[PDB]
Design a protein around this ligand. Sequence first.
Ligand SMILES: Nc1ncnc2c1ncn2[C@@H]1O[C@H](COP(=O)(O)OP(=O)(O)CP(=O)(O)O)[C@@H](O)[C@H]1O
Ligand SMILES: Nc1ncnc2c1ncn2[C@@H]1O[C@H](COP(=O)(O)OP(=O)(O)CP(=O)(O)O)[C@@H](O)[C@H]1O
Ligand SMILES: Nc1ncnc2c1ncn2[C@@H]1O[C@H](COP(=O)(O)OP(=O)(O)CP(=O)(O)O)[C@@H](O)[C@H]1O
Ligand SMILES: Cc1ncc(C[n+]2csc(CCOP(=O)(O)O)c2C)c(N)n1
Ligand SMILES: [Mg+2]
Ligand SMILES: [Mg+2]
Ligand SMILES: [Mg+2]
Lengths: 514, 518, 518
Amino acid sequence: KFSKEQFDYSLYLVTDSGMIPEGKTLYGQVEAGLQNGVTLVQIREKDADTKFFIEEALQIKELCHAHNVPLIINDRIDVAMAIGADGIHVGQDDMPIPMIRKLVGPDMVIGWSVGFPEEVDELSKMGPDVDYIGVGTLPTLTKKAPMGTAGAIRVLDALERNNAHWCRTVGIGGLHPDNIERVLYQCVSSNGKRSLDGICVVSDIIASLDAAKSTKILRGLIDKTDYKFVNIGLSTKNSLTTTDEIQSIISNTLKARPLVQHITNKVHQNFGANVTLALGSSPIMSEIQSEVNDLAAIPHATLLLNTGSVAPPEMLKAAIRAYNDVKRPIVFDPSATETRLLLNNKLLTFGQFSCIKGNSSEILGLAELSNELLIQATKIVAFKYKTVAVCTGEFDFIADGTIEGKYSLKGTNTSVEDIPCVAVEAGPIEIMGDITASGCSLGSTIACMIGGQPSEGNLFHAVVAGVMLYKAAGKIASEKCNGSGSFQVELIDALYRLTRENTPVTWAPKLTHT
Amino acid sequence: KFSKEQFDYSLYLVTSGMIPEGKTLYGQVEAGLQNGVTLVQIREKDADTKFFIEEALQIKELCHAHNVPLIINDRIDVAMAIGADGIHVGQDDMPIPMIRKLVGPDMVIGWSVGFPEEVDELSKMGPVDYIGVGTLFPTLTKKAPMGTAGAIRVLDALERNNAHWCRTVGIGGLHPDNIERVLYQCVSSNGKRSLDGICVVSDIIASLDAAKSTKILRGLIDKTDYKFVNIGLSTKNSLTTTDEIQSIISNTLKARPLVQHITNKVHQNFGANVTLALGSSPIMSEIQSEVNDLAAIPHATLLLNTGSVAPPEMLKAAIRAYNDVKRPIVFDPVGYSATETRLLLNNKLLTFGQFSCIKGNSSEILGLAELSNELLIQATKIVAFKYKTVAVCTGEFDFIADGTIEGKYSLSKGTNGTSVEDIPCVAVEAGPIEIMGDITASGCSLGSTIACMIGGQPSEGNLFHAVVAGVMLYKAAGKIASEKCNGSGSFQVELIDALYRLTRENTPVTWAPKLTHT
Amino acid sequence: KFSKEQFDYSLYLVTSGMIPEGKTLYGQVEAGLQNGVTLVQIREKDADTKFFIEEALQIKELCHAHNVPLIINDRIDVAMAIGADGIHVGQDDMPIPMIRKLVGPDMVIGWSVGFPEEVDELSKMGPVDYIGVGTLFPTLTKKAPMGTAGAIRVLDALERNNAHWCRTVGIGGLHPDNIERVLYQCVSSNGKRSLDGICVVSDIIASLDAAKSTKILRGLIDKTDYKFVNIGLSTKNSLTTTDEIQSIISNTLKARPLVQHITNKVHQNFGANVTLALGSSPIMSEIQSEVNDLAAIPHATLLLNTGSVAPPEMLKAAIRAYNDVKRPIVFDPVGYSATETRLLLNNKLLTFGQFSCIKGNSSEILGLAELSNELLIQATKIVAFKYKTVAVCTGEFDFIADGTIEGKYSLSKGTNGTSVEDIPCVAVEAGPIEIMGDITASGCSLGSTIACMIGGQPSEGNLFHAVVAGVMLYKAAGKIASEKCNGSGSFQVELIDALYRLTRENTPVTWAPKLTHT
Ligand SMILES: Nc1ncnc2c1ncn2[C@@H]1O[C@H](COP(=O)(O)OP(=O)(O)CP(=O)(O)O)[C@@H](O)[C@H]1O
Ligand SMILES: Nc1ncnc2c1ncn2[C@@H]1O[C@H](COP(=O)(O)OP(=O)(O)CP(=O)(O)O)[C@@H](O)[C@H]1O
Ligand SMILES: Nc1ncnc2c1ncn2[C@@H]1O[C@H](COP(=O)(O)OP(=O)(O)CP(=O)(O)O)[C@@H](O)[C@H]1O
Ligand SMILES: Cc1ncc(C[n+]2csc(CCOP(=O)(O)O)c2C)c(N)n1
Ligand SMILES: [Mg+2]
Ligand SMILES: [Mg+2]
Ligand SMILES: [Mg+2]
């Protein structure tokens, strides 16, 4: 009675009978949903009696059809048939798809639980006879290892690579108002052609004291089309960064005197601090959870996040969340050891970053494995994490992956290949890499530059401005130094003087299009 | 029959469940009455109101035999029953006027007070006869421990409210290791009122030799002089002379003071270099087990920066380790007054010991003063006095106040005419040098310099002069570096060089900063 | 302002921690004041003496609105503070004269009393205004529960000491399942004084419908008639006539009463045979789960022997199961008064329910009377009255007293002129027959006979007449057997035969024993 094409995956509610609040029933929760924006319902009973199960399925089936929304069973095939369900959801260890299809006929919708690209290959070597997948666990407690959006993207990419046009996708696992826009936003195919088809919740709706309210919320999120994660203009700029724009950037940050919280390694503490206040803004080296919220609330707080520090992931997660809660900029600086690959992928799941900064090695790791290769790898990373990426080296490349904060359910009509990407070169300056925390301190610089921008500011321009400034100041130091030692002290001086006489026309570095 | 005026709160004993075997409540109370308790309160929060009465009638006779009144606790009826000399209650025990209604005047009524809001009621009631002030330090015998700073808030409310009838005693956590500091730094902001006595339970009641324990408290209480650091604390009206500054520097180069740094990461290296630029040696140890043997070293000195990763446990242990040995501590409360979290931590640290010097920027010093240039001078004097300390407020002008009053303390007097408003407060300035604030831990490194100067001081030295010596020096070195530098980066290397050069030739006659009365 | 005389202790409510959710102390107390509490005491053994005061002032107004005084607890100062109507204390709370000294006269003073020794002091004090008497039954809200027997000891001390000023209320464990028995059997030995009221906490405070709970207690309390067994209890001055005895036997042969035996092992078989000799049926079940359905059976009757292996748990359950259904219980306290152990067990059993008849030899009856022939007659009357029961004292003469007073009870009155000394007490004798005591459970089997006689009685029957009927019968059968026997062994088989023959032809005109007024 429902054709495969009539299934709206927008907000897909999946039940759990033993998590409902008192003075509330499954029928009661599933009805609020239906009146506030649920479009697909699945009945889940991993333990209940096969007969209670049936009586329950039948009563909710009436309900769903009342509002004209189908009903799915995960994953009782026989029950699904018995009650004549609209579809069924099975997983990687339940009943194989062919057997099922052989029992239910081609017209019923079959969902599969997928958390790996290999499973999309399998799905596609079965033809259009699997109709949707729920992408892995993005960490829930409703279960009894989470992959993040990065993990979702690999799965989306495998659909696109295999052109499994027939298969829809919903995200699931962990999903609440605090990660949902980030999930819609950064969960798109690399070619930008295919995004998530809808969103799955259990706890957010089922275990709610007000299901009607909780649903309206997820609705707002889902059918909204724009995610301002940072209070700085994300506008797309195809023109190079003019000397007036750079100059306006620097005026701004001297005036605002941004606050740049540094969570970072030991070696980068003093240097990173001095760079910051050489840029006429102030730095806190706080690593205390109790504090992060107060710090983020300060008028121009900016977080520079540097990996390999000793701080617990818990503190890092709360920090990232505090800055995102306040729409304040985070600059991320991260794969040489398995331990670091773990920790970094994990932080990348905690939040929405304003800018990601690394060298050739780190950017190629994040891109998922020359000079054109770097410009490719830099555009991937920017797009993957919807961020401004920066690849250091002789030439610094800077890609804008933000896409103006746009998300939809169709992807973004723009890809990993055609985002704006510029370059900044000032000749060879090998000595810049013979000094410790160089890229760390480029990070401090970027943060201060992003720190000072107002609502009408521009994110991309401020990162470029920051890269120019740092390169310009490294050219000047290389000329005035007598070795490593004096180079670093010349660098800070050069940064101090350059911004104190804010006159970009003068600087050495040359800004081109990649 | 005692009159309210005849009460001597000097050493106020509060009494059971925590008595040592082979000993009696009666025995201990007698031990204290013989070697020093001028007032006894009976506290039996769990006993049968029949046993309570028997116990109380027994001890009322013991007390009265030494001419010391007896005060009952959460119980106005036991106190009438046995004809007690007074009763003590809390904010949740029986309202005071009701109490007064049953017992009539001429019976002393004590109240438990931890906050100024309560002193306000105390006053809207007119002539409540004494109060025990909050629980200063964590006891084990409602609200959390507030330390002298919370005591002081309450003494000031009495003063503001002109509640002259009301006496005060301090209570909670009070032992030989904190009494003289509690008595020394618990005085009203106007120098006019201090604690009237000190109140103990576990220090005597739970004592194996309660006779010894009491004599110790008695000495502590009726002494008037708190030598917290082995360096002279005499008051100095005369500007610090070039001869003196030259003698400080000499003395520190010679002593070569061990300077233990407990400080954020950004300061570690800078501060270590400033330290051995001044011809002493730094140690960056954050290890509890070491602190004791570290501070035993001749001329040891502790610079304490807040924010520092260290657990409040080790911090308490260090502070006490230096106070235990009478070595100076320099406290720098980082923008503490910036987040509720740092406010908490510094306030707690400030209850752990006596600091020689407290150093901070304008924001911090206005915070600690429990909130221009006169205002900064008013604030610096408040901090100096509040914590009985040499406070330094850094800025274009550095301000240095001396709140130590020569280590003097008395009961109830409470100060030899010395208010928040008239401790000596000098000034140091060498023009605008904005660049000193464009390099990290400028103030932390100021702290290193002060520590070294204070560090090398002899028994006959002067704490105040050494703090000023070190601010002159640091400012003199900053003036020079700002001339020779080409930006932030080189400013810092010159700052160290300048300190290195300046102290290798004590010729302060040469330095650039101007030292003046405020 | 109430005068001591205006206090109505009828239903005395004592108040917190055990309140049902969605309900307030205030609400419950109001529920009770509306549907029956004539006095409220406030009890807050753990609250802050400030909250206590607030709570008490609030409820004093509630009370006073219904014209019922408020009494405070372990607290004489809260009670002066708020101007309470009285205060209640214990043996370990504040001594009474001190209390009187502070509150003056005109404030009611209650005392907790569990023992006569305490009533003695109460009296050596003269005019303490009321007492709550011990903790009768095990409560969950010092000394152990004493039941009515312990209450009675205290009422007698008041009487002996002529302490007329002092009122009494019963307290502890008091619920609908024991109130009418406590009120019925808690009267002085001279019939002149009974409880003045009944006192509850958990029955109302912890009630989901405290309005219902109170009305139930009110009915119970102001009724005057306790129908504990479904057989008439009218007082009988006239000897039991041969026509009557013949009607008892008829009635029991017809009813064919189920007689449940809980009894030592030596009696099981003998007692079972005596039972079906009398044309009824015995059951020897000692099983808790059965007791309820067993006693539901028409004409069910319970013979309860002490010593019996059974756990006091099952015994309590049985006793209550028969009282719950108003079926008779015959209690035989085996030489209980022989060992502290049996004394304990029987005293406890005696607190579990109401017995129709209590039967014992001389030793036992003198024990239960809480200690010749007149003496045995004085004792049998005491036991009968003490337990509000038909008591039988077996010997050469069997004595039968009737202490039931027709089920009547009142508050404080306390009896329609009926003392330990003038309940009807008859006598039964057929000469010396020493051989009746040379066979085991002679007395236990007497109990079987009584049970059957009582067993078959109708609604309109008479309890007393049936007990005498059965003693005549048993004695008549013993006379015959002693003639036909050749020693102990055959005596027993003839005793049964004689009972079998005697009841197959009710011709009591024929029997040998003589029934006479005492
Ligand atoms: N060979 C080179 N020529 C010119 N500039 C260079 C350079 N190598 C590095 N830089 C400059 O230094 C910055 C970052 O370079 P890079 O990322 O390779 O250092 P890094 O990542 O190893 C820092 P860390 O030591 O903390 O790991 C840029 O501003 C860049 O222009
Ligand atoms: N405008 C000015 N003119 C002259 N000296 C100045 C100055 N501003 C700061 N200084 C110098 O720098 C020191 C104090 O630094 P300040 O109190 O302003 O910041 P701060 O205490 O927070 C340092 P940190 O970076 O460790 O937080 C003093 O030695 C002082 O004389
Ligand atoms: N001297 C006597 N003359 C006539 N009858 C006597 C008698 N002594 C006992 N009896 C009869 O025996 C019964 C009471 O027994 P008794 O009270 O003397 O011992 P007892 O109650 O302890 C029995 P058990 O063996 O179960 O402990 C009565 O029915 C009574 O009439
Ligand atoms: C369509 C579909 N995709 C996946 C699964 C498996 N699954 C993975 S996570 C999760 C619990 C999340 O609850 P919460 O949102 O409260 O964290 C479930 C039920 C499924 N049953 N159906
Ligand atoms: Mg790097
Ligand atoms: Mg500072
Ligand atoms: Mg017997």
